[PDB]
Design an enzyme around this catalytic site. Structure first.
Site, mmCIF file in Angstrom:
data_model
loop_
_atom_site.group_PDB
_atom_site.id
_atom_site.type_symbol
_atom_site.label_atom_id
_atom_site.label_comp_id
_atom_site.label_asym_id
_atom_site.label_seq_id
_atom_site.Cartn_x
_atom_site.Cartn_y
_atom_site.Cartn_z
ATOM 1 N N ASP A 1 0.866 -1.164 0.000
ATOM 2 C CA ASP A 1 0.000 0.000 0.000
ATOM 3 C C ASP A 1 0.914 1.229 0.000
ATOM 4 O OD1 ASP A 1 -2.469 1.590 0.498
ATOM 5 O OD2 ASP A 1 -1.665 1.785 2.538
ATOM 6 N N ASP B 1 -2.149 -0.523 5.922
ATOM 7 C CA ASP B 1 -2.606 0.139 7.145
ATOM 8 C C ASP B 1 -4.104 0.423 7.144
ATOM 9 O OD1 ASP B 1 -2.538 2.180 5.172
ATOM 10 O OD2 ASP B 1 -2.386 3.692 6.723
ATOM 11 N N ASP C 1 -6.938 -2.895 2.833
ATOM 12 C CA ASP C 1 -5.805 -3.816 2.701
ATOM 13 C C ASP C 1 -6.142 -5.173 3.319
ATOM 14 O OD1 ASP C 1 -4.193 -1.879 1.435
ATOM 15 O OD2 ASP C 1 -3.484 -1.083 3.351
HETATM 16 MG MG LIG Z 1 -2.920 3.072 3.482
#
Ligand SMILES: [Mg+2]
Ligand SMILES: *[C@@H]1O[C@H](CO)[C@@H](O[C@@H]2O[C@H](CO)[C@@H](O)[C@H](O)[C@H]2NC(C)=O)[C@H](O)[C@H]1NC(C)=O
Ligand SMILES: CC(C)CCC[C@@H](C)[C@H]1CC[C@H]2[C@@H]3CC=C4C[C@@H](O)CC[C@]4(C)[C@H]3CC[C@]12C
Ligand SMILES: *[C@@H]1O[C@H](CO)[C@@H](O)[C@H](O)[C@H]1NC(C)=O
Ligand SMILES: [K+]
Ligand SMILES: [K+]
Ligand SMILES: [K+]
Lengths: 39, 992, 268
Positions: free
Chosen positions: B345, B686, B690
């Protein structure tokens, strides 16, 4: 000795055990010392 | 099952408000009926998420109790009770042998079960985190009246109302809104507030303004909407199910364990039954044939090995806990070392997740600011009088403020009330000009025009802090081009000057460069109003232009971006030097995604996409050979219409990959694509978007401070300080533990031979039993334990970060080279050293080696209390047995003595001990404690009854010394050959 | 094939052949040096045989000899072992002045034939007639068990002195030259009868010390025949034969350390 050779069929397993246990303990302490040199 | 959920969603934001009501039998104004709502409740079911069916811990524990070694140990434990039963019936045996050994072995299985159970842990509460995002209550309009209801009682069709501060209770079709902004970070990973209005604004429902989603929250304003989806049927409720439902799967390390279990189990059953028949042929009673088999089992199975592995893993996880890297699953300690591909990410992972000033354009010059958290860069400018003029506008023409009580925390980390761009500017000036509040006290704001959608600028009028003036200063900021159309002069190095086409062109150049860097650019200008035309009491009208907004003085430009974390660029390069492929997978827009890719080193300098080639050469993209482009940037909207085979080609054909504007399922798809090619993949993230990717990853790593609860539930590892450098450490630790496990496994296996061979010679030679079953467990469960563990503290023999990731198909934890060395070479030398001490004890008591062959018959005969030795003396039953058990004791001690050398040689696979040294203090501890344990077991009174351990005479200890030394020399000579010729012979045969 | 090519399969064979060959040669070397440190006449240690064991001829199934008097093949098992032992004490086995000698027909003192050296031929052992074993096919009813003291090189069995009280209080106490053997069971439902050298219920000290198999082959150790003409029948009788001496001790674990454990039962 001659007829008085009783010592030939004898062994001080008691002392050997005392010494063996002393050694085992001291090796155990020595090990702690080296390990604890930083934790 | 979940293949449906891996697809992009379909919606009804294209319909008119009225049309949408027909579909759900609803009223736009009155809302549903109390009766109709209750009807729909029973129809569709509750607005809730149901957690997936889990496997109870019962079945999880017992599933370990039947994995190769435990199976063999079970056969041994029962075969003990078998021989015991056969005894209790035939000849009354007042002994406890088979009974107790059967109890001991069954305990070994149970305790070993706890260790593997502890290792195979799965702490997963994905669906629980998602459930936390549904509010307890919602506001609905029913029978023309608004009331709060249990959010679970919400159904498709009713009229819902939301306002700033509340969670979206369900997927809504916006029908009415007033200044409504929403935080869609759940779906995108981006927290910038998105406007919501009844008007349809994009074919894509995840981008349109007239849809609001469950799992997100309203940030400001008010909105009303019609519920289109409820519970599991919402967009993120499906993501929930997908994430929670995904099959976990076996880790690389787990697969390795099972693999050597098969090997060792194989040789165990081989020699087991190979000698069981070999005994019956020799005319051994089934009574004995089983007793020998039990011994064979105990000899072949390394009873303490699986627990060693677990402890070595645990100890490695403890070291990483001490670098702010939490491991939730013990096996994930190794996966990072086997990782060949990282899918990362961007926002809050690679980046700080905070709009930060990156560059400034003043004095016809591009200046760069420091974007790093801890400010590890340098200054750009302080001297120029122009800077102070720009700095003043950035502070004054700004409505952002620091939250109360932050004075303790660093400037860049403190919470700010305001939009991202104003916060960035605030923190920029506060950093390099001190307290901004001071500047806003010295220059009292009298009138202002806040940033308007139409004006595209924000202006402010202040009392000049200067005493010799104390007059009125005008400042404004906005779109760079709009600010330009309002300027006549430029503050160059202090003094103003006319805005000639020259500087105007340099402005465009500066503007295009900063924008090309993916940075948001703002214009800044001011105007010192004429004193005579503006008295100390002159009133300014903000509603109607009461003051000039043209012919102003352009001061400068400022650019900003959500920047990389300080450690990220260097960590990415380090991953790439270790031969790990790094891919970006983000919900963010392509221009931003690509710019950070270059910033952190995902896309290296000079590498192009097909679009880059086309623009440079000024040719159509179809005219570009796509193989000429090693880099690519794929938008989620295009990803959606590509098959997996085509996704596989993208993955194969590019070294530098950026997947931008991806949905959560799309991240999962990219991860699966990488895995499909046979790669071990890590995911770093995070956000809740995800979660599926983190779950599917061989190892998911979540950010601890910036991470959402969901992401950290889906992960195997948490970076508690958001230190991306930890990934580099993790892969390094992972590789080191993999090698050290080999060392520890070889060490443990080596001592199997001296435990097997005595039982074999017992049959083939008909001599007294050299070593007992109990004695074996004193080794594998006792003496070898701490030494085997200590190998986990071995330093690397070379630069492990310099080698490529292991091939999980070829590079195994236990291979033929390990067995050849442990079983065929070193263990064989240990066996002899054991036998030697055995022959020494017997020969010094009167039974010379020659007369021992074929004597077990009379030796074991309990009724012969007069066996003749070599010297013509006669021994009772218990007398000769004491010597025999003393033989078991010295054979045991011989193993310990030969394991001394083995411990030192297993220290290194390639290097010499004279190179690697003896700096492992745990290992040395192992040597001392191992010897202490052995001595204690021999000399402690009463141990001759509980374990049949007898006191050894001093000379006995030294029997195996010459064999212990040969091991050290042999292995040192062998490894000397390895190093001296990387060719292959010694290497391809013995190099673990 | 399975692992490698033929060339590789060969090389792995040439290695392990030389390797295991060397290891065998080294193992043998260490055995050589071990033997080189040992005497041919006397073992390095003797503390594990120290207190002599007492063993008998009737091969006990489990320290027990039960049989039926009214049955032939009921005791023919115990007569096999009984014969095996006594067959060695034949007169035809003890012929000429070599290597046997006629010793006192009455319990006498020790006999030292020098040291444990080969500086002399085969040390001459005292003759022993199985004819000294009065009354004892063997006892078809009420067995005639034969006792024996385990041989230990250089061991001088020393009888107890009549300083204080004794079990068989002072009866036929040949204090100076006899190692006594008194069998017992309370539970006194038997009839102990002992046979031996000079008619004494012991071992004549003139058969000591034993010089070992290497320095004294064909050597004969003294026997003590014991007959239990018990007037009882059809019950397990736990009879323990105990030897007494200065160098004689016992153990709760080793039930053969200077004593017997016989479970006679004439179930007829
Ligand atoms: Mg992120
Ligand atoms: C040792 O003495 C025994 C005494 O019983 C010998 O047994 C003799 O066996 C032969 C042939 O089987 C019989 O004819 C005799 O009746 C037995 N007794 C005697 C006194 O001669 C036995 O043969 C002898 N063993 C050796 C090796 O000489
Ligand atoms: C007690 C004694 C008689 C048993 C001796 C067993 C010997 C023959 C065994 C023990 C370990 C064995 C070796 C272990 C490892 C390998 C490597 C593998 O790629 C091929 C077989 C090979 C080379 C084995 C051949 C046979 C071997 C050398
Ligand atoms: C033993 O045999 C002798 C003959 O040699 C005989 O006189 C005597 O009665 C027997 N003794 C016993 C107790 O049966
Ligand atoms: K084992
Ligand atoms: K995972
Ligand atoms: K082992």
């Amino acid at each position: 000795e001659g007829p008085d050779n009783d010592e030939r069929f004898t062994y001080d397993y008691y002392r050997l055990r005392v010494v063996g246990l002393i050694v085992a303990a001291v090796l155990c302490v020595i090990g702690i010392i080296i390990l604890l040199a930083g934790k | 099952l979940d293949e449906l959920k891996k697809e992009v969603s379909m919606d009804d934001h294209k319909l008119s408000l009225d049309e949408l009501h027909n579909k759900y039998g609803t009223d736009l104004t009155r809302g549903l009926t109390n009766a109709r709502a209750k009807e729909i409740l029973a129809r569709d079911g509750p607005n809730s998420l149901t957690p997936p069916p889990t496997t109870p811990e019962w079945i999880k524990f017992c599933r370990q109790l039947f994995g190769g070694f435990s199976i063999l140990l079970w056969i041994g434990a029962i075969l003990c009770f078998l021989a015991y039963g056969i005894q209790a019936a035939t000849e009354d045996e007042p002994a406890n042998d088979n009974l107790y050994l059967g109890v001991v072995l069954s305990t070994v299985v149970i305790v070993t079960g706890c260790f593997s159970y502890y290792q195979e842990a799965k702490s997963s509460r994905i669906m629980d985190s998602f459930k936390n995002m549904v509010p307890q209550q919602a506001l609905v309009i029913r029978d023309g009246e608004k009331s709060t209801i249990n959010a679970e009682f919400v159904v498709a069709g009713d009229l819902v109302e939301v306002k700033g501060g509340d969670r979206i209770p369900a997927d809504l079709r916006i029908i009415s809104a007033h200044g409504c902004k929403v935080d869609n970070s759940s779906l995108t990973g981006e927290s910038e507030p998105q406007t919501r209005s009844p008007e349809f604004s994009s074919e894509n429902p995840l981008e349109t303004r007239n849809i609001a989603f469950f799992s997100t929250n309203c940030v400001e304003g008010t909105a009303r909407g019609v519920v289109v989806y409820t519970g599991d049927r919402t967009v993120m409720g499906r993501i929930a199910t997908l994430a929670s439902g995904l099959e976990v799967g076996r880790t690389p390390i787990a697969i390795e364990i099972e693999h050597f279990i098969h090997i060792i189990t194989g040789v165990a059953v081989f020699l087991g039954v190979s000698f069981f028949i070999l005994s019956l042929i020799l005319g051994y009673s089934w009574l004995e044939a089983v007793i020998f088999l039990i011994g064979i089992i105990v000899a072949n199975v390394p009873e303490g090995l699986l627990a060693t592995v677990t402890v070595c893993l645990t100890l490695t996880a403890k070291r990483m806990a001490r670098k702010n890297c939490l491991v939730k699953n013990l096996e994930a300690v190794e996966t990072l070392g086997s990782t060949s591909t990282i899918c990362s990410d961007k926002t809050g992972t690679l980046t700080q997740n905070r709009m930060t000033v990156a560059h400034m354009w003043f004095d016809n010059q591009i200046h760069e600011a420091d974007t790093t958290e801890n400010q590890s860069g340098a200054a750009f400018d302080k001297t120029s009088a122009t800077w102070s003029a720009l700095s003043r506008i950035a502070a004054l023409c700004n409505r952002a403020v620091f939250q109360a009580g932050q004075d303790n925390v660093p400037i860049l980390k403190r919470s700010v009330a305001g939009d991202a761009s104003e916060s960035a500017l605030l923190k920029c000036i506060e950093l390099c000009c001190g307290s901004v509040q001071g500047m806003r006290d010295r220059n009292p704001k009298i009138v202002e025009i806040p940033f308007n959608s139409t004006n595209k600028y924000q202006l402010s009028i202040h009392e000049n802090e200067k005493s010799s003036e104390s007059r009125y200063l005008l400042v404004m900021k906005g779109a760079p081009e709009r600010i330009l159309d309002r300027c006549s002069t430029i503050l160059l190095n202090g003094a103003e000057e006319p805005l000639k086409e020259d500087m105007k062109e340099a402005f465009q150049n500066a503007y295009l460069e900063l924008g090309g860097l993916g940075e948001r650019v703002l214009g800044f200008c001011h105007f010192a109003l004429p004193e005579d035309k503006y008295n100390e009491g002159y009133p300014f009208d903000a509603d109607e232009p009461n003051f000039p907004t043209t012919d102003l003085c352009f001061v400068g430009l400022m650019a900003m971006i959500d920047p990389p974390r300080a450690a990220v660029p260097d960590a990415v390069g380090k991953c790439r030097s270790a031969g790990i492929k790094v891919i970006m997978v983000t919900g963010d827009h392509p221009i931003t995604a690509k710019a950070i890719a270059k910033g952190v080193g995902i896309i290296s300098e000079g590498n192009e996409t097909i679009e880059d080639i086309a623009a440079r050469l000024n040719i159509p993209i179809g005219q570009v050979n796509p193989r000429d482009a090693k880099a690519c940037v794929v938008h989620g909207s295009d990803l959606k219409d590509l098959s997996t085979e085509v996704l596989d080609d993208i993955l194969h054909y590019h070294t530098e990959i950026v997947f931008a504007r991806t949905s959560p399922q799309q991240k999962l798809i990219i991860v699966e694509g990488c895995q499909r090619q046979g790669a071990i993949v890590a995911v770093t993230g995070d956000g809740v978007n995800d979660s599926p990717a983190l779950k599917k990853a061989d190892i998911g790593v979540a950010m601890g401070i910036s991470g959402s609860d969901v992401s950290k539930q889906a992960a195997d590892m948490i970076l508690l300080d958001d230190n991306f450098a930890s990934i580099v450490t993790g892969v390094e630790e992972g590789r080191l533990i993999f090698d050290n496990l080999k060392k520890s496994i070889a060490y443990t296996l080596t001592s199997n031979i001296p435990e097997i061979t005595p039982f074999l010679v017992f049959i083939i030679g008909n001599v007294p039993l050299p070593l007992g079953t109990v004695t074996i467990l004193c080794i594998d469960l006792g003496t070898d334990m701490v030494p085997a563990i200590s190998l986990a503290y071995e330093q690397a023999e070379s630069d492990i970060m310099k080698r490529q990731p292991r091939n999980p198909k070829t590079d195994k934890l236990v291979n033929e080279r390990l067995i050849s060395m442990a079983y065929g070479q070193i263990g064989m030398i240990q066996a002899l050293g054991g036998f030697f001490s055995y022959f020494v004890i017997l020969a010094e008591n009167g039974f010379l080696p020659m007369d021992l062959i074929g004597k077990r018959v009379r030796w074991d005969d309990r009724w012969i209390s007069d066996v003749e030795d070599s010297f013509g003396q006669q021994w009772t039953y218990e007398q000769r047995k004491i010597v025999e058990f003393t033989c078991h004791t010295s054979f045991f001690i011989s193993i310990v003595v030969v394991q001394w050398a083995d411990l030192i040689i297993c220290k290194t696979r390639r290097n010499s001990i004279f190179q690697q040294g003896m700096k492992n203090k745990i290992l040395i501890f192992g040597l001392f404690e191992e010897t202490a344990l052995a001595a204690f077991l021999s000399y402690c009174p009463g141990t001759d009854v509980a374990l049949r351990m007898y006191p050894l005479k001093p000379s006995w200890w030294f029997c195996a010394f010459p064999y212990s030394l040969i091991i050290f020399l042999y292995d040192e000579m062998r490894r000397f050959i390895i190093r001296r010729s990387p060719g292959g012979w010694v290497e391809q045969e013995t190099y673990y | 094939f399975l692992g490698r090519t033929g060339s590789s399969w060969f090389k792995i064979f040439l290695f392990y052949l030389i390797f295991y060959g060397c290891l065998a040669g080294i193992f043998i070397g260490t055995i050589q040096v071990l033997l080189l440190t040992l005497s041919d006449f006397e073992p390095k240690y003797q503390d594990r045989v120290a207190p002599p064991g007492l063993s008998h001829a009737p091969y006990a199934i489990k320290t027990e000899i039960s049989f039926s008097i009214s049955n032939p093949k009921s005791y023919e098992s115990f007569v096999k072992s009984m014969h095996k032992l006594m067959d060695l004490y034949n007169e035809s086995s003890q012929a000429g002045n070599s290597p046997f000698e006629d010793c006192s027909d009455t319990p006498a003192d020790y006999i030292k034939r020098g040291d444990l050296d080969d500086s002399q031929g085969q040390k001459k052992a005292c003759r022993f007639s199985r004819m000294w074993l009065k009354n004892c096919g063997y006892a078809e009813g009420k067995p005639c068990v034969v006792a024996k003291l385990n041989r230990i090189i250089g061991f001088y069995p020393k009888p107890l002195k009549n300083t204080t009280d004794l079990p068989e209080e002072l009866q036929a106490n040949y204090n100076q030259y006899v190692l006594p053997l008194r069998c017992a069971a309370r539970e006194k439902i038997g009839s102990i009868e002992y046979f031996g050298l000079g008619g004494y219920a012991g071992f004549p000290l003139q058969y000591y010390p034993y010089y070992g198999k290497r320095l004294q082959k064909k050597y004969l150790q003294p026997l003590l025949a014991i007959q239990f003409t018990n007037l009882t029948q059809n019950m397990e009788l736990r009879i323990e034969c105990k030897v007494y001496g200065e160098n004689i001790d016992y153990s709760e674990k080793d039930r053969f350390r200077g004593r017997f454990e016989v479970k006679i039962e004439v179930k007829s």
